[PDB]
């Protein structure tokens, strides 16, 4: 896929989000379509309605509140019309721009919560093989996230120290590394203040060559016994696909060995033994700005609420329009392909990893382990963090949350 943006196709995708949730709500609560009607027009009767949370003006203030939101209907539901929301009869809520929601009520009388997606399961045979793989011992997965060098130099000394540690002490089964590796917004890269490197015989002429001379030789030293997965950022200079969802990097081009490196898409979903991982590298946790009412909702932890919104929305970056950094960078959503950012198979992941510039964290929310490993190094050059996941050795629900320990390590 090329750099095309097509408005009809983008709008198709946004329409389909509303329609597919309309079917999820109808099956879960066992309602008939005749119970759903157009909320944008007057009726005498209470109705059920599903739509997208949008601002009530298209040129809107940065800061929204419960009196300045509208609901957008699907093309079939209300000819795509948008209607202002009266939320005065509802004491507890958390909404955000792009959220798909279901109401009974346009004055909202009740919010029908979207149901949590199902968890993956495994057969007894599969779980026994996984048990044999590990030879009794526990599963270890390490997770890191860029940047890997500081803002004022090109030192990977900390990464070398880390690699030595995982090779010779920690000895995990898998290492997951999120970009950016060479961050295009790094201030020396941005300004072109790139120095001569005396430790390279031939100087790189491009940022792609800078990766081959700076990262490849150090990454190559990761033990072949540790499978290593690379997932990019749309800020990765080494990627030529700077929109989310983002195609995987090409391993051969990075000159990394086949023996232990796999390049994955952003986002990507995969299993390590039975455990389903959902990995996405746009900062939902930083970006999702809730409009909130109610003491009970506000007393909860923001990170719990945001993780539940993601699980309910069944997509790793449900905010729309996506956030902008003001022009320098952004979510860079390629709206036509938001489909690929939905939960694969409709399954909730066992472990969900969505790196953020917020402080590192690991939390169980709705039986899903949610992990932010934090940035590997801080801009100043001080120690950052990474995440270590240790899971006890195991149709059946994986209960990863009951068996997994997550440490956030300097």
């Amino acid at each position: 896929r090329t750099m095309r943006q097509n408005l009809q196709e983008a709008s198709d995708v946004l329409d389909d989000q509303i329609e597919s949730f309309t079917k999820i709500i109808q099956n879960h609560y066992k309602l008939s379509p005749n119970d759903f009607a157009d909320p944008t027009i007057q009726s005498q009767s209470e109705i059920y309605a599903v739509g997208r949370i949008v601002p009530d003006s298209p040129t809107y203030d940065k800061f929204l509140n419960p009196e300045s939101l509208s609901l957008e209907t699907s093309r079939m539901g209300g000819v795509g019309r948008r209607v202002r929301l009266d939320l005065s009869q509802v004491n507890e809520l958390s909404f955000f721009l792009g959220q798909i929601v279901a109401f009974k009520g346009f004055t909202v009388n009740s919010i029908l919560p979207l149901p949590y997606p199902n968890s993956p399961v495994s057969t007894s045979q599969e779980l026994q093989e996984f048990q044999a793989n590990l030879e009794g011992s526990s599963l270890k997965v390490i997770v890191t996230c860029g940047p890997y060098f500081a803002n004022d130099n090109f030192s990977l000394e900390l990464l070398q120290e880390f690699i030595d540690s995982i090779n010779n002490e920690v000895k995990p089964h898998v290492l997951i590394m999120f970009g950016p590796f060479i961050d295009i917004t790094h201030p020396l890269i941005a300004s072109g203040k790139l120095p001569n490197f005396p430790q390279f015989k031939t100087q790189p002429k491009t940022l792609d060559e800078l990766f081959l001379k700076l990262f490849t030789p150090i990454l190559k030293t990761i033990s072949p016994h540790i499978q290593t997965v690379l997932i990019p950022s749309t800020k990765d200079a080494i990627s030529n696909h700077a929109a989310y969802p983002q195609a995987s990097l090409i391993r051969k081009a990075l000159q990394l060995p086949k023996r232990n490196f796999k390049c994955m898409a952003n986002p990507s979903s995969f299993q390590i033994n039975e455990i389903y991982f959902g990995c996405s590298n746009v900062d939902t946790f930083k970006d999702l700005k809730e409009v909130i009412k109610g003491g009970t909702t506000s007393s909860r932890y923001r990170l719990d609420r945001v993780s539940e919104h993601i699980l309910q929305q069944r997509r790793y970056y449900p905010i729309f329009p996506g956030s902008i950094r003001t022009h320098i960078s952004g979510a860079d959503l390629d709206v036509s392909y938001l489909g690929l950012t939905e939960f694969v198979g409709g399954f909730s992941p066992d472990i969900m990893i969505i790196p953020s510039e917020l402080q590192h964290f690991a939390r169980v929310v709705q039986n899903v382990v949610v992990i932010n490993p934090g940035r590997f190094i801080r801009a100043t050059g001080n120690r950052g963090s990474y995440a270590q996941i240790t899971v006890q050795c195991p149709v059946y629900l994986h209960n990863v949350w009951k068996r997994a320990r997550v440490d956030l390590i300097a």
Partner: protein
Amino acid sequence: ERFKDTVTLELSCPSCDKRFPFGGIVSSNYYRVSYNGLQCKHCEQLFTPLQLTSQIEHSIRAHISLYYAGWLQCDDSTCGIVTRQVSVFGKRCLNDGCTGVMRYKYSDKQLYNQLLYFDSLFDCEKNKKQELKPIYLPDDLDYPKEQLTESSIKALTEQNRELMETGRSVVQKYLNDC
């Protein structure tokens, strides 16, 4: 006509930080393409290839990111709103009753033209034939004081072929992907 609305590639000097538009092997009061490369006229320091190409790539990516911000604009001259909101009927304007058509404000034609312009800057044949778009209008205070000769441009272009081609490959990274 294709590049009439593109914007210039702005480079910053690694030593002294002076900013300037780069128009190819053409006259400028800010920079010179000498026999050993791109040179800053304020401080005389030479760009290395990585110092040039990292900036080319950074600009490209700024453009591509703006493009993916997905701003839209309305046709109707009596409305004109710009928004990132997209109606489930994409072309339809979100102003109550407005009949104008909505269009991505950074169209993919504009992006492609912007990249083709960047490509032209590092195109040897185009540099030699002097077919690049001028970076300066005649009344601009920075209009260049000295004009380069044709024969200087030919020579300087062949002397810098390698630099040009490497600068060009960085644009092509994104042009084949488009």
